[PDB]
Amino acid sequence: EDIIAEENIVSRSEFPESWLWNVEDLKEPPKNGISTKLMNIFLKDSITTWEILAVSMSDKKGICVADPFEVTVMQDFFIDLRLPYSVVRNEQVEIRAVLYNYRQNQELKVRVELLHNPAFCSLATTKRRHQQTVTIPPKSSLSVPYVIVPLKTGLQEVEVKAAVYHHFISDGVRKSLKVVPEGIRMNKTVAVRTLDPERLGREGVQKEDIPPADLSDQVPDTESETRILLQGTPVAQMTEDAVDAERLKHLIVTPSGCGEENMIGMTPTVIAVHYLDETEQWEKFGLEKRQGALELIKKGYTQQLAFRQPSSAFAAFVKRAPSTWLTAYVVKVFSLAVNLIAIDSQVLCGAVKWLILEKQKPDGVFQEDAPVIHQEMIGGLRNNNEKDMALTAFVLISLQEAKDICEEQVNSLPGSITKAGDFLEANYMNLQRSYTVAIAGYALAQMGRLKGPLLNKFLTTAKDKNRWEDPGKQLYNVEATSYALLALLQLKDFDFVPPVVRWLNEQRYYGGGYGSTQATFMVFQALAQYQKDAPDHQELNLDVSLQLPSRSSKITHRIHWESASLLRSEETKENEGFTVTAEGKGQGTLSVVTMYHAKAKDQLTCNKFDLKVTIKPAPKNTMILEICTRYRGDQDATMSILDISMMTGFAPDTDDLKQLANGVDRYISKYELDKAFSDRNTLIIYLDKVSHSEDDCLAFKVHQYFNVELIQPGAVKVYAYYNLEESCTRFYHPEKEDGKLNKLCRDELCRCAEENCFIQKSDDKVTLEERLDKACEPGVDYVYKTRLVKVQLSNDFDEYIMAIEQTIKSGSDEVQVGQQRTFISPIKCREALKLEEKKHYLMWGLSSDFWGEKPNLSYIIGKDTWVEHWPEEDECQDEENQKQCQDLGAFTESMVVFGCPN
């Protein structure tokens, strides 16, 4: 006509919050240093202002964030369809289509329509449109309320169109909204399991069986999600404190001497640098100082070279016979100092070669023929008893220290180490002194030859399990205990270590002094090595698999120390029990929580407000609308809002509204009162408060200015200003007290009421050919013969359980043979239906009469569904009538044997 047809209107539908997520490049040739890019973009459908932000990255210029660029997209006439974030299924709701006219001098006469959607009960249907004709003054807006009922979950579409009479102008809006199931979302923790495979599992394997969640109050036909959460729990090891840097200040010494003296002065400086490097304590000590330490060391070394004999051995004086001990010691120290300064390979390895070929007996023992002058400097070796074992152990240790440096130069080294090791092993069990036990123990531990009874003697020998001691010098015991610490470290026996380390530190010995060289060197080497071998955290290496009955292949998660915090999640829709298996070393946490929708009583709705709304005939049609609200809090509510929308073709009484506005403790805008009777069908009343102890009530008259065949129920919403979520909505209608749009429900599913009742016929009776003609029609999806097993009652429906005895024609549904299907009929259609249990029936019908999906799928007995009584065989054979039974037989025969033709 003079208005744009609905079909011709293409609704705006593109409303993204963000877009233009684009990567571009300024490839264009630049004038000056700048390159201009012209982009063609298609704007979205939103009516708003877009902020366009650009960030550039250049290899010469760097990163640059541009100032935001705005684009305003505007229209003189449009629909703003205001949708909530989500709506509950089967729950009546009101939405607003607000129409905007921003023309200055031109009013707009507009027809607006809510499109039909099978997923919503609304006014509009397939057979009939929901159109309204309204007028919008210039520079004004108009609220058009639509009352709908969402029928299915998920994203659902709402479309509103509007066109202008006598103007080639239109607009449409197509939006989606989330439809969610009824009830409240709950998280239920199925299980919490600590994972400790070594502590909680046999053979290093921990198995936990997780049961299915008990969903007793779960809403029917609701998806549930089970979440499996894996996490690693990091455990940091506690290591003993490192010796303070300041406390090694005295260990820095200038070497002087004397083949022996030089080594005595060289010992502390070398071991101090060794300990400081290991513990990285150079910061508190002073970084600049390290250089210094070095050349003292260098000095010592150089000086020591003066006392090197032609055999490559060492002694106090060149004239003096060479010492086995002093030579082996020079090896020990130089080897430990090989990182710090350049040491001649020939000197060290020469000394080693001399020790082996000249000083080692056939049994592996090392012997001293020219003892040092300074007995003090040999510490624990001073004791006359068990000299062979102790000295062989000492020299052997010096050899282990030099193995990596001298293996190619010295061929005799592997054999010597082995030979010494044999002598140590052979006579170890006879040792009576803690010192010898400890040092020989360390020597054997270096070769992995400290095991069994030997290891037990070594550990047993320790007093209080913290130290190795003997009567005599305390220093000897410190030295010995240091050796045993080194042994334990070599063995990786970390459980035995902490008391021993604590004891050494407890002694508070920091070397330096007369007769201190061995205790100094050993205690600091042992502590340095402790720091080196110490673990900062416990080992976390877990392999965790979960086996799900739904999935053939198991899911495997490896939890390591770096990724220990990382939360791993696996989700299953099925509420099935499963098993989790954990392997490896470490600690973990398993948590299984199932999220479901739980049926809730009392009802979620109107928990903050009680709202009663009433519409009654008043003593040109006018009615009285009464609204009674009560806050459900402990005290009266603050300032609140009543949002009222009129029934179709109704407007509030102006005088009543004015008197209400003048009433104290409520407010109605000058804007509302100024507005004409039409076309505004919405009214907001601001309350200064809402009582919590009694209903606050008000009432006003509403006049029916426009008459319509179908009247949309009006609505009232109450909420406090600070919280829009905590509202209550009531509907009102003259024909329906509840204000609820007519609908039928079966279980959790609801459909809009329709005139689709089974048609009862006929007195005159019918022919075979009519059955053949109707059933072979393309619209017919199924033709069955079946028997009524059981008749049941529902709130809105009668249910008939039919076991399909024969599928004459099969539909999309496959009933196979002897399966059961439920046929339902609205209560208003009872008189037409005549069904009895245990009796046979020929039925057929449309696919449009299907409702829901299997399980509990229903066949609806509507107007187009055929249902005929089938006489039993015995009954079939008798008169009244043989005709019907023969006709059913022929119908059957024709239908299965030949079917329908194209």
Q: What are phi and psi of 840, to 5 degrees?
A: -90, 155
Q: Is 101 in the site for another protein (CB under 8 A)?
A: no
- Give how many residues touch Cl ion by CB under 5 A: 6
State the Cα–Cα distance between residues 441 and 460, nearest whole angstrom: 12
* Cα-Cα-Cα-Cα dihedral sign, residues 335, 338, 340, 341: positive
> Would you give the binding string for another protein spanning residues 216-255, x where CB under 8 A is met?
---------x-----x------------------------
Closest separation between CB of residue 71 and Na ion, Å? 19
First and final C-alpha spacing in the chain: 41
Considering only residues 518-537, where is the footprint of Na ion by CB under 5 A?
none
**Of 819, 644, 820, which is closest to residue 732 (Cα–Cα)?**
644
**Which position among 46, 141, 409, 412 is part of the footprint of Cl ion (CB under 5 A)?**
409
Considering only residues 656-715, where is the footprint of another protein by CB under 8 A?
667, 669-672, 682, 684, 686
Q: Is 7 in the site for another protein (CB under 8 A)?
A: yes
**Which position among 104, 203, 216, 288 is part of the footprint of another protein (CB under 8 A)?**
288
Give the interface segment with Cl ion, choosing from 7-15, 262-270, 406-414, 561-569 (CB under 5 A): 406-414
**Of 896, 803, 886, which is closest to residue 841 (Cα–Cα)?**
803
Q: Which residue has the tokens 């010796």?
A: 243
Considering only residues 130-149, where is the footprint of another protein by CB under 8 A?
141, 143
Query: For residues 20 and 604, which CB has a smaller minimum distance to Cl ion in the complex?
Result: 20
255 contacts 295 by C-beta, under 8 angstroms: no
**Which position among 205, 237, 722, 820 is part of the footprint of another protein (CB under 8 A)?**
722
State the Cα–Cα distance between residues 377 and 264, nearest whole angstrom: 7
- Give how many residues touch another protein by CB under 8 A: 127
Closest separation between CB of residue 316 and Cl ion, Å? 23
Q: Is 159 in the site for Na ion (CB under 5 A)?
A: no
State the Cα–Cα distance between residues 441 and 456, nearest whole angstrom: 11
Q: Which secondary-structure segment (H or E) carries 285? A: helix 282-285
Q: Is 41 in the site for Cl ion (CB under 5 A)?
A: yes
Query: For residues 378 and 402, which CB has a smaller minimum distance to another protein in the complex?
Result: 402
Closest separation between CB of residue 800 and another protein, Å? 36
| Binding partner of 47, given Na ion, another protein, Cl ion, none, CB within 5-8 angstroms per partner class | another protein
**Which position among 6, 80, 159, 748 is part of the footprint of Na ion (CB under 5 A)?**
80
Query: For residues 8 and 635, which CB has a smaller minimum distance to Cl ion in the complex?
Result: 8
**Which position among 186, 191, 200, 595 is part of the footprint of another protein (CB under 8 A)?**
595
Q: Which residue has the tokens 């079939």?
A: 876
Closest separation between CB of residue 169 and Na ion, Å? 18
Query: For residues 30 and 778, which CB has a smaller minimum distance to another protein in the complex?
Result: 30
* Contact residues for 599 (Cβ-Cβ < 8 A; gap 6+): 182, 183, 217, 218, 219
Query: For residues 460 and 563, which CB has a smaller minimum distance to another protein in the complex?
Result: 563
State the Cα–Cα distance between residues 795 and 744, nearest whole angstrom: 9
589 contacts 195 by C-beta, under 8 angstroms: yes
Number of Cβ within 10 Å of residue 65's Cβ equals: 9
Q: Is 726 in the site for another protein (CB under 8 A)?
A: no
- Give how many residues touch Na ion by CB under 5 A: 2
**Which position among 166, 199, 620, 765 is part of the footprint of another protein (CB under 8 A)?**
166
The secondary structure of residue 303, as a DSSP letter, is H
Query: For residues 80 and 672, which CB has a smaller minimum distance to Na ion in the complex?
Result: 80
Closest separation between CB of residue 16 and another protein, Å? 7
Q: Is 293 in the site for Na ion (CB under 5 A)?
A: no
Give the interface segment with Cl ion, choosing from 223-231, 348-356, 530-538, 847-855 (CB under 5 A): 348-356
Q: Is 672 in the site for Na ion (CB under 5 A)?
A: no
Query: For residues 30 and 471, which CB has a smaller minimum distance to another protein in the complex?
Result: 30
Q: Is 81 in the site for Na ion (CB under 5 A)?
A: yes
Query: For residues 81 and 528, which CB has a smaller minimum distance to Na ion in the complex?
Result: 81
Q: Is 456 in the site for another protein (CB under 8 A)?
A: no
155 contacts 567 by C-beta, under 8 angstroms: no
Closest separation between CB of residue 523 and another protein, Å? 21
**Which position among 507, 638, 691, 856 is part of the footprint of another protein (CB under 8 A)?**
638
User: Which letter, b or e, does each residue of 324-337 get, where b requires 16 or more Cβ atoms within 10 Å of its Cβ?
Assistant: bbbbbbbbbbbbbb
> Would you give the binding string for another protein spanning residues 541-580, x where CB under 8 A is met?
----------------xx-x--x-xxx-x-----------
DSSP string, 720-764: ETT-SSS-EEEEE-SS-TT-PPPEEEETTEEEE----PPPP--SS
606 contacts 186 by C-beta, under 8 angstroms: no
> C-alpha angle with apex 893: 892 to 896, nearest 5 degrees?
80
Query: For residues 175 and 457, which CB has a smaller minimum distance to Na ion in the complex?
Result: 175
State the Cα–Cα distance between residues 388 and 385, nearest whole angstrom: 9
Q: Is 50 in the site for another protein (CB under 8 A)?
A: yes
Closest separation between CB of residue 14 and Cl ion, Å? 10
387: helix, coil or strand? helix
Strand duo 820-826 + 858-860: pairing: parallel
159 contacts 174 by C-beta, under 8 angstroms: yes
Closest separation between CB of residue 181 and Na ion, Å? 25
**Of 647, 644, 641, which is closest to residue 657 (Cα–Cα)?**
644
Query: For residues 228 and 330, which CB has a smaller minimum distance to Cl ion in the complex?
Result: 330
Q: Is 350 in the site for Cl ion (CB under 5 A)?
A: yes
- Given strand 780-793, what is the order of strands in its sheet? 850-851, 858-860, 820-826, 797-809, 780-793, 840-846, 866-870
Residues that bind Na ion (CB under 5 A): 80-81
Q: Where does this chain bind Cl ion (CB under 5 A)?
A: 41-42, 349-350, 353, 409
